[PDB]
Amino acid sequence: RFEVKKWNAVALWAWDNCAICRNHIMDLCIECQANQAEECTVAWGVCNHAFHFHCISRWLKTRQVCPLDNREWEFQKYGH
Amino acid sequence: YNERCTFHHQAREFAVNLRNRPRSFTFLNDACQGLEQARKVLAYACVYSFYYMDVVEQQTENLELHTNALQILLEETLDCLSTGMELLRRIQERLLAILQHSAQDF
Amino acid sequence: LMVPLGPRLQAYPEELIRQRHDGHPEYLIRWSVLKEHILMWLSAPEVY
Amino acid sequence: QEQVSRFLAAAWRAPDFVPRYCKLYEHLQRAGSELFGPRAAFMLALRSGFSGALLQQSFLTAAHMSEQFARYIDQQIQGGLIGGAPGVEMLGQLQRHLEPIMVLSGLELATTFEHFYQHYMADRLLSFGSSWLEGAVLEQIGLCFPNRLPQLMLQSLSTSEELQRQFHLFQLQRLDKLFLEQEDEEEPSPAISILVLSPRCWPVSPLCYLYHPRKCLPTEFCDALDRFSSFYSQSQRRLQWTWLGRAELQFGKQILHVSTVQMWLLLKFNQTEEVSVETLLKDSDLSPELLLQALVPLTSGNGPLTLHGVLRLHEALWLIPPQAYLNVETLEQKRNLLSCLLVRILKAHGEKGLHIDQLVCLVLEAWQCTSTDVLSCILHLLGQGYVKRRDDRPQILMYA
Amino acid sequence: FWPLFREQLCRRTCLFYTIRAQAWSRDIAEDHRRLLQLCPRLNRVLRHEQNFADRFLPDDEAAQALGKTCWEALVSPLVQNITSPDAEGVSALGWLLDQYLEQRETSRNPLSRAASFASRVRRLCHLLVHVEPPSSSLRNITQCWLSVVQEQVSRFLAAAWRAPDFVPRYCKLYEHLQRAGSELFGPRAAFMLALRSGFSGALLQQSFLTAAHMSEQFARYIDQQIQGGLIGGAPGVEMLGQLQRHLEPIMVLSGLELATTFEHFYQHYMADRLLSFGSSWLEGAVLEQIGLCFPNR
Ligand SMILES: [Zn+2]
Ligand SMILES: [Zn+2]
Ligand SMILES: [Zn+2]
């Protein structure tokens, strides 16, 4: 006979505009959409989310984590 | 046995430290003399062991703990006289009894 | 015993002033405030 | 550059490619030092020459080279962990040779290098443990990876450990509540460790899944899984169990280390004296190739089973299947499509240009891939001379 | 007419509950086995006061004021009383926690006296800390935990500083006490600091020959683990993980009178390792973890 003395089970966990300001992903920035005349370029980060440079500038000046995945935000500088 | 050896070593170290560096003073001196005698007895006991049993072991551990506490207090200090004299007499008697038991054993 | 009652208020008992839900009388102890006077019924274990 | 390109085009198929490449790097560095003395401009020149020669290559060959680099690192790590006296020498040679491979930093090969490093790191972390070796190698060459996936894997393991601690506390609290309820109204086992993975960072296959766990594993293990699932839900994301993992078995005086498929087959074996392969397949409902790869190291020498194909009893072993390396005989098609769409969007958007991040947004929507994939395609098209950056606005992409 | 009522009711509540606190305290001082029953009484008082507040006081600020008064009147002197050492040196909460840790091993059978004892202690401590954020209650409870840990570790050290299992049993004790502290007081930082301080104190209260022997033991354990992990196969890859776990119980030497001897003995073994095998990854990793424990680098 056989007696299991240890086991290690594995399990995957499984389950898109500018969520932080909720405007359309390709649209403009609401903070500056109130002050009409649209200068925020989109920003990308290692954690693979796309947000507005305005949104992110402010938010980061407040806090220092990615608001969507709880990791230290890192401005993506690959391919640049 | 390890606990008794550690207690004896600590008591010897404290006694050496006290030797290296007014009723309270007389009481401390008497306690130090009694602790030195008890430490000599404990060293002899450990040497004999290295070369009512449970009750005797418990009594030895209690005496070692009392001697260590008295030495620690005397180091921290730097009726009562009758109690100290009785403790010293009991310690000397225990030392003599342990020596007699050792001589009878070997 | 000067029971603290705040940052700058303490209390101390003065004297029994009467006797009267457990079959055992209470005591209407008076308490002097040292910075009025409070009246408090206290049970026998509590006052002891 | 001429020397290294000659070498690359000369021998990229031979199996000694990575050792020869590293020896070439060391020899050229020593020669440059002997000629021009120790300076920094010349080291920069050497690195740039290697980079240029790598880039001036074909795509299938670049993919082959990336796979070879990853395979070499994996072999060295595995050997240095397992072996004895030679393993130390191997680990030394590796911590030396890791400098030539950092020439892949920032190039257009880093994505394929990382996508191939992921597989081998997964097999390693699941067979052995999250050894300090992986952490050291990543602190050394951790910037070659654009997306930083291996670091996320290593973080997943620690997250799982924290989950274990919290699960213990949660169970204690449930017990305390029940004891209080029962008091106020009145007034020799297998250790299981669970590992949760995040499909953003682990490349688990959609073929290594367990759908109906109760129909395969014993009741005790199924109950343990159910309890942990309840905790995950009550504290949360579902949970899909997989056939991956390892286990320790006791068989007589022998202590065996097996994979989950191996453990399950053997456990089923412990209530009879012979098993039929067709019955095993029908009952398991998994890949027959997987079943064969799991069975192979069992019927072989020093194995607890015997073949006759019926399986019977044969009458600290380590019977874990070795890592079957990939062979680059779809990445090219993906690059082609991404390049085509990117060129189309760049030509349509007017010579006024567009922003690169907004460009990635457009390309991802059009596909609707990865930001790193689109970025590397962009680098490829910039190198090949089909697009350029606006001198006035570097973020503006101007077609040529 | 609000501030008159505020002052009068605050005073009345504060005095009544201070009197009752001293009553319960003098009750618990007589028989030490009364805390297990002290939990439900507190539950009743808190429930009644919350009912009253919710029914007859509109402003959330008013409610919070009454609650803070009731708490700081009843639970603060009760704590400062049940966690105050006697002449021998055993407080009531100290005794309770010591008994918890001692009977923890036999508390697995979910139908036994130890199970009930453990449940009661757990609930009582969680209640006593359920209002923390340095208050005058968390401080006393922290010192009590420190004392319990120090006594346990001192007993262990004076017991077995000779056997060749010293370092493994030391680390197992560390893990046991840490998990116990977490399951008692919830995951907090002050209590981990208390654990480290207790271990450090137990170490310091020792003699010189014993300190030297302990240091040599730690160094030999590190060396044996490193050598095995490098040389052996699957057993070695198993040992290196245990080694990685066990460095935190050794980092407690960072900044004591033993670090000098620990370092003087680590030198001797690192020399032979470095002249038998090369400056591998293992030495660099071990140092990047426990580096600051060496005064002279
Ligand atoms: Zn936005
Ligand atoms: Zn904006
Ligand atoms: Zn993110």
Numbering used by the authors:
A (entry chain C): 21 to 35, 40 to 61, 66 to 108
B (entry chain B): 2296 to 2316, 2326 to 2355, 2361 to 2387, 2403 to 2430
C (entry chain B): 10 to 29, 32 to 46, 61 to 73
D (entry chain A): 1481 to 1667, 1691 to 1739, 1750 to 1821, 1830 to 1836, 1845 to 1858, 1864 to 1902, 1921 to 1952
E (entry chain B): 1302 to 1434, 1465 to 1628
From the paper:
Superimposing homologous regions of protomer A (unneddylated) on protomer B (neddylated) and vice versa show that the hexamer could be formed by either a fully unneddylated or neddylated complex, the former also observed in a map obtained through symmetry expansion. One of the most abundant cross-links (K188 with K188 in the ARM1 dimerization interface) was absent in XL–MS for the ‘monomer’ mutant. It is noteworthy that unneddylated CUL9K1881R–RBX1 remained hexameric. Examination of the structure showed that the arrangement of CUL9’s WHB domain and RBX1 RING would require reorientation to achieve the conformation for neddylation. Structural modeling of UBE2F on RBX1’s RING in the unneddylated protomer A suggests that neddylation requires yet another CUL9–RBX1 conformation.
However, the vertebrate-specific CUL9 complex with RBX1 (also called ROC1), of interest due to its tumor suppressive interaction with TP53, uniquely encompasses both cullin–RING and RBR domains. However, the vertebrate-specific CUL9 is unique in encompassing two distinct types of E3 ligase within the same polypeptide. With 2,517 residues, CUL9 is the largest cullin and RBR protein, and among the dozen largest E3 ligase subunits, and its structural mechanisms have remained elusive. The CUL9 structure distinctly encompasses both neddylated CRL and RBR E3 functionalities within a single polypeptide, in a giant triangular, hexameric self-assembly.
